[PDB]
């Protein structure tokens, strides 16, 4: 209910998949939860991570340089080494006897408990780690030891500066050393990133009640402390090691920072500090589903505590970074940001606003960066790249060695150039839902203007006043061009023609309710009257390609492309969630077919809502029939192999619509338990997947729920399905609190301040403190 657990030895990817589960973080670290006592080998990675630490590799391949930003694993501060009678303690998979580790949500703790056989009996082992989310550069570690004997022990208290980035299998071709230690003094290692320039000070003290440890000169590269005890027979020996982390990125003086931190904390500090801070938490946080799912509670609240340890306003504050594809957990894409913000931003924005602020400024610190981005590629405006890391550049590879004939080839990744439209959406969203407008003059008006420059600009006036859209990805990755060309790109992407009509018409009201705000920088950024009237007839005369039936085509000419016989895939190969690298397999081009990897025409309606979006193809001049969600969902999900773990809750928000409630709480139920489960055996081996974290949140509270807050007031319009017997949270609204209780069939809402909601569409007041009930 609140304790991830897990009993018994994984190996390989799934035994690096529990430990990105179990990572713990606060925003400024996230430390996976691996075991003290083990090094990276094929069963154990530690992992240390910092927000915005990252090195750029080279490593030459093919006669070429390929760069790798690659967020940094800091050395690991949490190894442990023990001897018996100067024996080694040989602690593996074959000498450990009883192994449980898990993380309670309740209060951020991670515990692993071990019995190892030893030569001489058997050593219990168990290890608390937390993490402080107030002084958050503060880890710390409590070690019980006991054994069934007697004999002389020494324990060995490590930083490890000699390890690499090792993650993921497929990064291990690049150069992986990213960092030289440059001294270790005392309590405190220091390291130095190869090419970024970032100081890396690592710290720590272990202390004990029965024992004293001292540093001492240890191996290249490892700082040492070593203490020595006797053990008595079934006698208890406790350890604690504090650390402090700090580095010159968000530091002026990060050595001497640390030196202060090991001086004035503690672990008990530490665990306390965790304690308070989630019991405080879940106050508000929690999302309490009563059904007949017995592991769905969980899930909803590992969801819950994951997004909240990626980013969180008491340390994010002060730190220049967002949440990345994995948080803080791992190494898969290398820790870079993605257009993935999209879902948890709007989380962030409803039920913690301030964090959600913190993140954004890290697009908003950027827009130099994409405005030189869109320079570099020929364009105008802000240009934000797909992959963005430590400067705001393009992190994506332009370029791609072929596999088969050994010879560079275009990489077309970075042409999904709508990631600029959820970075704007994601303003609105927060502006929308909190009302702080403070963002908006603080760079996030700038940042919509210049990326609208880079949209406009883009947009090509054919000869009948239609405005088209040329050379980019729409969400769906495994179209990256038209049938014969090597020219990267397609035209008229549904969900990017949408998306910049929207963003257009959130310009526009801008300009009437935020007229003072907007001439200023509307002068200091030249988007002058041409921008605006450019601005205007792009807002109505963008094109969409619609069939007689109303299928509104992903991209212009993708009705011509062939169809793939999925059923047949499907029992020759088994899964085809990757069936465009069986199709390469096969010499064929998934360019060539009707297949989707995920929402991409329907990403619209996950973004605005199926109301919205008719809106703005009407807006735009287009006819829809009154079916047409259902045809549009119908004709795409046919063509959807969900290759991606974002895949299905789209569909499942859109059959919640559709009132197909078999089928959305079955696709809610696979995704949100994609992590957790691990099936297929490893998916989670290279970082959590957080975008489906909060994606599956998403479902449950907005479109099960039925809670939107971003369309201007707070609708209420819940549709739970039977087997959901209560379903209760709570949300922020413009600094208003809201509750509420809901079962199949009555929803209650309380706020603590007055407010005008409207639910089932019907218009509601609320009094403050004064539930009401809709039944
Ligand atoms: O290729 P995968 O890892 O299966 O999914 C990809 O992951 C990206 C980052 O998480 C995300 O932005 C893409 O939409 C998604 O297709
Ligand atoms: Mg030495």
Do not use: C
């Not at 992992?47 to 030459?60: C, D, M, P």
């Not at 549709?719 to 949270?729: G, V, Y």
Request: no cysteine; proline share 3%.
């Amino acid at each position: 209910a609140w304790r991830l657990m897990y009993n018994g030895l994984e190996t390989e990817k799934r035994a690096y998949g529990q430990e990105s589960l179990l990572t713990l973080g606060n925003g400024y670290v996230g430390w996976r939860g691996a075991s003290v006592f083990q090094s990276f080998d094929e069963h154990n990675y530690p992992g240390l991570y910092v927000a915005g630490v990252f090195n750029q590799t080279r490593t030459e391949v093919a006669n070429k340089d390929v760069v790798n930003e690659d967020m940094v694993n800091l050395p690991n501060p949490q190894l442990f080494k023990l001897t018996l009678d100067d024996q080694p303690v040989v602690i593996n998979h074959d000498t450990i006897t009883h192994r449980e580790a898990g993380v309670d949500f309740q209060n951020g703790l991670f515990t692993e408990e071990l019995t190892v056989a030893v030569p001489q009996g058997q050593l219990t082992l168990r290890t608390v780690k937390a993490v402080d989310p107030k002084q958050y550069h503060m880890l710390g570690i409590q070690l019980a030891i006991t054994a069934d004997f007697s004999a002389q022990l020494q324990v060995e208290s490590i930083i490890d500066g000699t390890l690499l980035n090792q993650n993921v299998a497929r990064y291990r071709a690049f150069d992986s050393r990213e960092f030289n230690v440059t001294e270790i003094a005392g309590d405190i290692l220091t390291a130095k990133t190869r090419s970024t320039d970032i100081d890396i000070v690592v710290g720590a003290e272990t202390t004990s009640d029965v024992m004293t440890f001292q540093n001492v000169e240890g191996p290249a590269d490892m700082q040492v402390s070593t203490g020595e005890v006797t053990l008595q027979t079934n006698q208890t020996v406790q350890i604690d090691k504090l650390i402090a982390i700090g580095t010159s990125y968000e530091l002026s003086e990060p050595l001497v920072f640390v030196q202060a931190a090991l001086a004035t904390h503690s672990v008990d500090k530490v665990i306390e500090s965790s304690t308070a801070y989630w019991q405080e938490v879940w106050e508000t946080a929690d999302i309490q589903l009563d059904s007949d799912d017995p592991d769905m509670q969980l899930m909803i609240r590992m969801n819950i505590f994951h997004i909240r340890q990626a980013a969180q306003h008491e340390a994010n504050k002060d730190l220049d970074a967002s949440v990345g594809s994995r948080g803080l957990t791992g190494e898969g894409y290398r820790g870079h940001i993605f257009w993935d913000e999209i879902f948890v931003v709007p989380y962030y924005a409803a039920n913690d606003p301030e964090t959600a602020r913190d993140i954004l400024r890290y697009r908003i610190k950027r827009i130099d960066a994409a405005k030189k981005n869109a320079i570099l590629d020929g364009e105008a405006g802000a240009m934000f790249p797909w992959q963005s890391g430590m400067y705001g550049d393009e992190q994506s590879q332009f370029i791609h060695l072929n596999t088969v004939n050994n010879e560079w080839e275009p990489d077309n990744s970075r042409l999904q150039r709508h990631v600029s439209l959820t970075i704007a959406y994601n303003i609105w969203v927060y502006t929308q839902i909190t009302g702080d407008t403070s963002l908006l003059r603080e760079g996030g008006l700038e940042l919509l203007l210049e990326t609208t420059k880079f949209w406009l600009n883009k947009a090509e006036e054919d000869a009948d006043g239609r405005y088209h859209i040329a050379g980019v990805m729409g969400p769906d990755e495994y179209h990256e061009a038209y049938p014969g060309t090597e020219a990267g790109g397609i035209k008229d992407n549904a969900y990017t023609n949408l998306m910049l009509t929207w963003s257009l018409n959130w310009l526009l009201e801008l300009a009437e309710t935020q007229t003072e705000m907007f001439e200023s920088v509307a002068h200091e950024t030249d988007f002058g009257s041409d921008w605006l009237n450019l601005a205007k007839n792009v807002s109505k005369g963008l094109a969409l390609e619609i069939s007689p039936e109303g299928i509104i085509a992903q991209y212009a000419g993708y009705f011509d492309l062939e169809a793939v016989d999925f059923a047949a895939y499907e029992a020759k190969y088994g899964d085809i969630h990757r069936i465009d690298r069986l199709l390469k397999a096969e010499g064929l081009s998934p360019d060539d077919y009707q297949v989707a990897k995920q929402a991409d025409t329907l990403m619209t309606i996950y973004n605005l809502g199926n109301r919205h979006m008719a809106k703005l193809v009407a807006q735009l001049g287009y006819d829809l029939p009154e079916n047409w969600l259902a045809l549009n969902k119908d004709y795409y999900l046919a063509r959807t192999v969900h290759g991606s773990t974002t895949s299905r809750p789209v569909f499942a928000g859109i059959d919640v619509t559709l009132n197909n409630m078999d089928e959305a709480l079955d696709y809610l139920t696979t995704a949100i338990g994609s992590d957790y489960y691990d099936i297929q055996g490893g998916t989670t081996a290279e970082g959590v997947h957080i975008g489906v974290m909060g994606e599956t949140l998403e479902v449950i509270q907005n479109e099960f729920g039925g809670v939107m807050l971003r369309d201007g007031l707070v609708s209420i319009a819940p549709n739970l399905p039977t087997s959901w017997h209560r379903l209760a949270f709570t949300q922020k609204y413009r600094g208003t609190m809201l509750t509420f209780e809901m079962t199949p069939e009555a929803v209650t809402v309380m706020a603590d301040a007055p407010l005008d909601v409207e639910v089932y569409g019907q218009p509601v007041s609320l009094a403050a403190n004064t539930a009401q009930t809709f039944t």
